[PDB]
Amino acid sequence: ELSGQPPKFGGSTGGLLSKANREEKYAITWTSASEQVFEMPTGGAAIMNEGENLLYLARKEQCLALGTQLRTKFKPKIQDYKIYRVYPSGEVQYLHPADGVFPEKVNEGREAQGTKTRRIGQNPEPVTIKFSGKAPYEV
Amino acid sequence: AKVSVDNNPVPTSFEKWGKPGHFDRTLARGPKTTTWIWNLHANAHDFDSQTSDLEDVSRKIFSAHFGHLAVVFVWLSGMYFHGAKFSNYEGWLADPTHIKPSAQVVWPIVGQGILNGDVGGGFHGIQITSGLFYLWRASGFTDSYQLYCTAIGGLVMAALMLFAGWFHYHVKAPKLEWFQNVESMMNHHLAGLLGLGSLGWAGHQIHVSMPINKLLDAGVAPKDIPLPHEFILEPSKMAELYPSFAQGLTPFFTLNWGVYSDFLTFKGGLNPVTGGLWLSDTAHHHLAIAVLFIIAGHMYRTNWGIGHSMKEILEAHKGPFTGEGHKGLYEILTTSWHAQLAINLALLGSLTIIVAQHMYAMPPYPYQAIDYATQLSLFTHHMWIGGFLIVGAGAHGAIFMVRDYDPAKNVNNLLDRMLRHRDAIISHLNWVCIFLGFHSFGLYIHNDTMRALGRPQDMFSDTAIQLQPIFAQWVQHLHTLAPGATAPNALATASYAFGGETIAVAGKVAMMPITLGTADFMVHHIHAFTIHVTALILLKGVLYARSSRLVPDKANLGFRFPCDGPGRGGTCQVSGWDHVFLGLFWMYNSLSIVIFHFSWKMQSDVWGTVSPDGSVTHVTLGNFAQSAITINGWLRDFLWAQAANVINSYGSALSAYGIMFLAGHFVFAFSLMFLFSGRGYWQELIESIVWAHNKLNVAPAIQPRALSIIQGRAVGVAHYLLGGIVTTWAFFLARSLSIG
Amino acid sequence: SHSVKIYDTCIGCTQCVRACPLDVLEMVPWDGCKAAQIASSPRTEDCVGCKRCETACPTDFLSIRVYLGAETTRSMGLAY
Amino acid sequence: AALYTHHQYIAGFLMVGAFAHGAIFFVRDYDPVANKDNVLARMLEHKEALISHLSWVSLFLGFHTLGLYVHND
Amino acid sequence: ALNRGDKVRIKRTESYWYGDVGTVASVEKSGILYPVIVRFDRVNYNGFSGSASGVNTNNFAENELELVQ
Amino acid sequence: DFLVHHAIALGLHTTALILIKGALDARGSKLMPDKKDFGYSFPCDGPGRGGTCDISAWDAFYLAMFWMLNTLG
Amino acid sequence: MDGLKSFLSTAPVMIMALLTFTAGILIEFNRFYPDLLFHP
Amino acid sequence: DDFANLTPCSENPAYLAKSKNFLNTTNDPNSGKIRAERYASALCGPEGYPHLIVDGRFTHAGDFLIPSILFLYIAGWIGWVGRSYLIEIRESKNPEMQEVVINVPLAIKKMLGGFLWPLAAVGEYTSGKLVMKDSEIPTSPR
Ligand code: CLA
Ligand code: CLA
Ligand code: CLA
Ligand code: CLA
Ligand code: CLA
Ligand SMILES: CCCCCCCCCCCCCCCC(=O)OC[C@H](COP(=O)(O)OC[C@@H](O)CO)OC(=O)CCCCCCCCCCCCCCC
Ligand SMILES: CC1=C(/C=C/C(C)=C/C=C/C(C)=C\C=C\C=C(C)\C=C\C=C(C)\C=C\C2=C[C@H](C)[C@H](O)CC2(C)C)C(C)(C)C[C@@H](O)C1
Ligand SMILES: CC1=C(/C=C/C(C)=C/C=C/C(C)=C/C=C/C=C(C)/C=C/C=C(C)/C=C/C2=C(C)CCCC2(C)C)C(C)(C)CCC1
Ligand SMILES: CC1=C(C/C=C(\C)CCC[C@H](C)CCC[C@H](C)CCCC(C)C)C(=O)c2ccccc2C1=O
Ligand code: SF4
Ligand code: SF4
């Protein structure tokens, strides 16, 4: 399922809380080409080991911040990280990247979502939609 | 030699003077909006962001420090000139107990000549509260020509400092290796600057200041006293004043130092004639610290292998609980200017706070203790300076953490361990802040409610539930017994604040024992609460500058950003700069309470007039003990009562203070424009006004913009602090000049 | 959760996707602009509402708009 | 004194509320097409002139009143 | 119709330059639904809080521009 | 009485300025052309595009309350 | 030097020079003719 | 019979009592006497200080009308020279740079030509290019 030696860390007070065992947590895994020091999003510096790594964080934003640090602040750029959502029951949901291609570059087979066929100035007036559970952008 | 320089790195030309914003790449392009102006005045002296080369940054810092030295020299020379030409110093010297000091004269143009009040001796001018006259009298000044020569020398030194900056930047710029000789710098600055400075001042005092002050205190007129060089030229006068000077320098080299006991004493206390410290005590003091500093030099290995190494000491002091210990700190403090700035700012601010709290208890200058206005002004001024410097330390430390902190070089060292249990530190500190505020301010509110309800026996007072500071009383008792018991060769106590007799000069109390009771307990613990809260704010700024559970990437956003957005419920004021902005107000609050406590206690329990019988009548009588326990007492017996002298100042020589008083009450209120509002409203208003100016075809090319969020907060806090401090300054000066 | 809408004035500069810290936005093929790509918000339940995408948009008015709505644990960005 | 202060403060609160709820009306219940070219629409047309002349009168009062008070002081 | 160097007035009714005048920097001839590119001397509010400049170029449709020259 | 009545006039015109600009700009302005879509009371539109920070009409009322209190004082 | 002339012509220098000029005019006039409440 | 509550300062007992002790504003020793003389012709209240009457009457024209004309002339001069300099520099290649670095030659040339600002203003209004049309000004969405 989820495999990888955890990075050598001394432990900090900024880690997980009861939400991890009550609501959900997040896992980030990546392949490191050398055991080297990186920065915990929760505070402190830890060494990551050669090969597989696996880290548990409390928020998706922390996982993506770690991914950004891995992609930007290392000359052997780490582009292979994967972010999953881990539920208390045991279900693991693959989150990032969605289809294996980074969202920055366009990839075929994606579906447009939230796209409106008009411009921002063409939204309906509120008075024409009042007393209905709708908003001008929702229409 | 470890000297290494580069010749003519930057040509001296005037072209870049005509292109403002040249330093910044984002500003040198040219202004399109008004914000370009505000950025230009804000990113000017931030050399670290301008360039990535550390050597260039260090060179710029060196020359900028030369420039600040030149400015301070110009200020000192101006002070000496204005004390030499537009002052009654020569008049005051003959009659120091009947003439008020004055060194500012006002031109009569629109009726401001009323400010030229009668300072005694037929002189009309603004009374000064800096205490320069007492310092000059202690230094041995007797004529205005010497002051004029001092001013000329100060101007020459300022010009020399300016030339030094120009030379050491535009011509011969030091190398990076030169700047990182921290061992050599520390040796030369401990032995060559502090030790040598103390030795030179001790020599000046012994060979100049003591004879002149001894003749002055006896009753000799200033004009009769021999000029300072005549003592050196004819040592007969020096031997007459001090017999041991007949022995010459022989006992110094034979360790027969005791013969010098007459002019190198250990008396302690105050001089009865002037109310200041004994100059012999100060002479042995500055000599001893000179010897100590020269010995403290020669400690760090520089060029001959004979000395300690800072890195070895740092990496050798590690323990079980701290992992790597003090490892990597040497590279932190030798590669980042901001960490050095933070440490130095904190230590220096605490140092001026110590100066303020120690200069009033043992007044070192003649006739300074009896000039209550000068005492209060000096205490409050250096108090405020210390507070500002401490806040600046708290700021520039967070700047270092955001910019110069590198996780690679900090693994299991003390910095990383600090970054690991930061939540525990902040939580425990927050709890202690809440506990201190609750219990102390609740004692205050509880006393208020008990007094308002007609139950004074349920209060927290000396008559009611005591709450006595037993530990402070015990240490006062110990320090009162110190002469003879634990300091056998001392003659009197370090100061009369701890205890002893009442030293009073010219029928005015100079120093009498300062008793601590229930009110002192409450106020000291209130001080502790306020200080711990300010420390909490600044520590949260420093520790959480890199990231937090809310925003995990604040380091990439920078050090000075307004927010992350309206998401996550709202992320306003999360940057370290915002923590500094919030800590400035709490520093203001704490220091205001400190100066208020000092002023009221000084007026109520020490200052006053002594009768020929010996009875002491205080400025505000003994009302501090029974009034400072309720907030209503602070409001009525301190603010309302003592503000009479500043509200009734119109029509007299003190009118300016009154005006300035109101001025403060204005600017504070004005600041609430910027703190309470946001920039979108002002942007829309500017849109409407721009339409107005456009209708007449008078629209400006530089598009006007509302101030940024960070700029708005900065302007608000600046005008707020200015208004509050000016109000307090006017109130204090009027009250202290109106209490004799 | 918050709502994210992309209007037909998008030029496909992909700055909004890069600026998003919680991976809410995506780049899908299109034909209305020269770059032939438009932004999308499939993973909109993870959006916090930091408006970084709006800040990144260079059009005369934002071709991407964020309307804050119902607040969840994810929307508040809580770690507890 | 109490009655005057009380009813004047009440009047100020009500006068603020009138403008607040009028702005709420403009946000919610205002239909531009129905009230086309009438006085309500004409208000939003020369609103820039309204705000500019109001800013001018406010600044003109404030500058020369504060100046007189400070001059007398 | 609108070519290079054409001074045009903007009628988008929500852009920063509504009623202002700009010049046609380029026109793209394809199925693009906002093909005209107009640049302006003034800059808009675009940018993070504290930025010293905005954006002086935008894309418009042909129908929302009035030729002035 | 002359000076204080003119000061009261300044306060009235300034409070009216704040409330009126809020009411008229509630629908939208150059900084926020689509404010009506966001409702009457919203916090801001983020630090982008200049900073926003109290661009809503509710914020105009909140600012005008201070001037109402000052004029009443 | 051209650079010095350009620096002297910048906004703060011009604004402060004009302010000192106006202040000197007003101060000298008030010295030589003080207390002018109205045209008598 | 106008201003029955305001008496001439030349006879008001409070003004005459307080004018002996008038302070000297400048270094001139008799500035207070000059002020007392000059203010003795005004209209003093019961407390003896001069009051300015502004209702349009020409007997008290010195209180408002003359300073009003003076200030209006000076302010029009300032506004006109500023607007002319702005419009002049607007045709150059770097109008913003000349906003922060003042073109002192052109600046002074406009400085010295502002004394005829009323004639220039009326000619501007009649020429029609003093005021722009409403359709030529950028406006915010309604
Ligand atoms: C911290 C330094 C300091 C301070 C605060 C003061 C403060 C004061 N001095 Mg003083 N002074 C100082 C240092 C200082 N001095 C030094 C070092 C000297 C020795 C040279 C003097 C010598 C001195 C004399 C001889 C006199 C004063 C006087 C005064 C008082 C009147 C103010 C004044 O001179 O303005 C006067 C007004 C002006 C200078 C305005 C002129 C226009 C200015 C310079 C504008 C600047 C720009 C200008 C256009 C030039 C362009 C430069 C550009 C290229 C950058 C005032 C209390 C006077 C006094 O107290 O008389 C009773 C007086 O007569 N001072
Ligand atoms: C005995 C040697 C000596 C002395 C006295 C100093 C003194 C000083 N250094 Mg320094 N320094 C030294 C050696 C020394 N340095 C060496 C060897 C290095 C290289 C490792 C440095 C590198 C260094 C840096 C990198 C910096 C300083 C700075 C400073 C100044 C800090 C400001 C201060 O203390 O205010 C007190 C100010 C004064 C007391 C005024 C002193 C005015 C002149 C300069 C003193 C000249 C004294 C000289 C011995 C002649 C007097 C003898 C006789 C005429 C009586 C201070 C003047 C800082 C600075 O920029 O200041 C310029 C700074 O950033 N130092
Ligand atoms: C030894 C003292 C010292 C030194 C060398 C520095 C050096 C620096 N600071 Mg620092 N700082 C200090 C003390 C010091 N600071 C203290 C005591 C505080 C606490 C208040 C701060 C708070 C602080 C902040 C919050 C910031 C800096 C920044 C900076 C950097 C340059 C940008 C800057 O401030 O210039 C520009 C300076 C100004 C625009 C100041 C002009 C406006 C002042 C406040 C007006 C003062 C008015 C005056 C008191 C009274 C006038 C009255 C009027 C009527 C005439 C630079 C590394 C900035 C940075 O991030 O750099 C990395 C930054 O954001 N500092
Ligand atoms: C007849 C009078 C009247 C009526 C019917 C309404 C009705 C309404 N107003 Mg309105 N308003 C009024 C007067 C009135 N208002 C006045 C006078 C003002 C100016 C102060 C306002 C300002 C105002 C604003 C700014 C807003 C409304 C809104 C609303 C709508 C619902 C939200 C609301 O108010 O509930 C919720 C109300 C509250 C939660 C009130 C909480 C405040 C409490 C009562 C203060 C308590 C003080 C405290 C207890 C003091 C203790 C003292 C002790 C220590 C001794 C609703 C249509 C809102 C809207 O847009 O909805 C469409 C909105 O944003 N009104
Ligand atoms: C005593 C505090 C104070 C003062 C003086 C002002 C003044 C002003 N506010 Mg204001 N405001 C305040 C508190 C204050 N406010 C507070 C607490 C709030 C609540 C957040 C607001 C909310 C508010 C809003 C919402 C609005 C205003 C507006 C205005 C302007 C209206 C014009 C006017 O009244 O007279 C004219 C102005 C003055 C008399 C002030 C100038 C005073 C100085 C002394 C003049 C000289 C400047 C001086 C030479 C500068 C030297 C600086 C140098 C030393 C560094 C004016 C600038 C309105 C506005 O912009 O109108 C166009 C507006 O929309 N304010
Ligand atoms: C004097 C009475 C009035 C003040 C009473 C208040 C005292 C309250 C706490 C006792 C101080 C104990 C210090 C021992 C602790 C001590 O010496 O630690 C030393 C220890 C490091 O031991 P090592 O030998 O491993 O250290 C090697 C070092 O040299 C690092 O290289 O540090 C730790 O164990 C972590 C510190 C935990 C610290 C807990 C935080 C305490 C915060 C509150 C302290 C407040 C004091 C305020 C007043 C000064
Ligand atoms: C031309 C010009 C400009 C522009 C000027 C413009 C566009 C002006 C526009 C003006 C407009 C549109 C309207 C003006 C209205 C003026 C009124 C209503 C004046 C009223 C006067 C009264 C009521 C006089 C009142 C009494 C008159 C009397 C003499 C006593 O005192 C008593 C007292 C005070 C009662 C600038 C601003 C661009 C630059 C300037 O340098 C020149
Ligand atoms: C002197 C006299 C007289 C006269 C009087 C008069 C003439 C009066 C008037 C009065 C007036 C004339 C008043 C007015 C007032 C007004 C106001 C107070 C207003 C307000 C408004 C508002 C509040 C607004 C709001 C809104 C909006 C904004 C939009 C929508 C709508 C609405 C409306 C809601 C007589 C003969 C009798 C007798 C003798 C004496
Ligand atoms: C009033 C106000 C404005 C508008 C104020 C502006 C645009 C500043 C205008 C400053 C003028 C142009 C100059 C005054 C200050 C100068 C330093 C004066 C220099 C004087 C010398 C030349 C003599 C904001 O932009 C703002 C932004 C964020 C929070 C609150 C507020 C806010 O309260
Ligand atoms: S930033 Fe704006 S223009 Fe660029 S891709 Fe995103 S929505 Fe389109
Ligand atoms: S109110 Fe201002 S500071 Fe707060 S989140 Fe909105 S834009 Fe940022």
Residue numbers in the entry:
A (entry chain d): 3 to 141
B (entry chain a): 12 to 751
C (entry chain c): 2 to 81
D (entry chain b): 367 to 439
E (entry chain e): 2 to 70
F (entry chain b): 513 to 585
G (entry chain j): 1 to 40
H (entry chain f): 24 to 165
Give the published text.
Photosystem II (PSII) is the multi-subunit membrane-bound pigment-protein complex found in oxygenic photosynthetic organisms that catalyses the light-driven oxidation of water and reduction of plastoquinone during photosynthetic electron transport. The highly conserved Ycf48 assembly factor binds to the newly synthesized D1 reaction center polypeptide and promotes the initial steps of PSII assembly, but its binding site is unclear. Here we use cryo-electron microscopy to determine the structure of a cyanobacterial PSII D1/D2 reaction center assembly complex with Ycf48 attached. Ycf48, a 7-bladed beta propeller, binds to the amino-acid residues of D1 that ultimately ligate the water-oxidising Mn4CaO5 cluster, thereby preventing the premature binding of Mn2+ and Ca2+ ions and protecting the site from damage.
In addition to the isolation of two types of RCII complex (RCII* and RCIIa), a larger 450 kDa complex consisting of the RCIIa complex bound to a monomeric PSI complex, which we term here the RCII/PSI complex, was also detected in the preparation. Additionally, all the particles were pooled to generate a consensus PSI map at 2.9 Å. SDS-PAGE analysis coupled to immunoblotting and mass spectrometry confirmed that the isolated complex contained the PsaA, PsaB, PsaC, PsaD, PsaE, PsaF, PsaL, PsaK1 and PsaK2 subunits of PSI, the PSII subunits D1, D2, PsbI, PsbE and PsbF of Cyt b-559 plus the Ycf48 accessory factor. Other regions that could not be modelled in the RCII/PSI complex include the N- and C-terminal regions of PSII subunits and the N-terminal region of PsaK1 and the C-terminal tail of PsaL. A peculiar feature of the RCII/PSI complex is the opposite membrane orientation of RCII and PSI in comparison with the standard PSI and PSII complexes embedded in the thylakoid membrane. Our current understanding of the biogenesis of photosynthetic complexes would suggest that this unusual PSI/PSII orientation in the complex is artefactual.
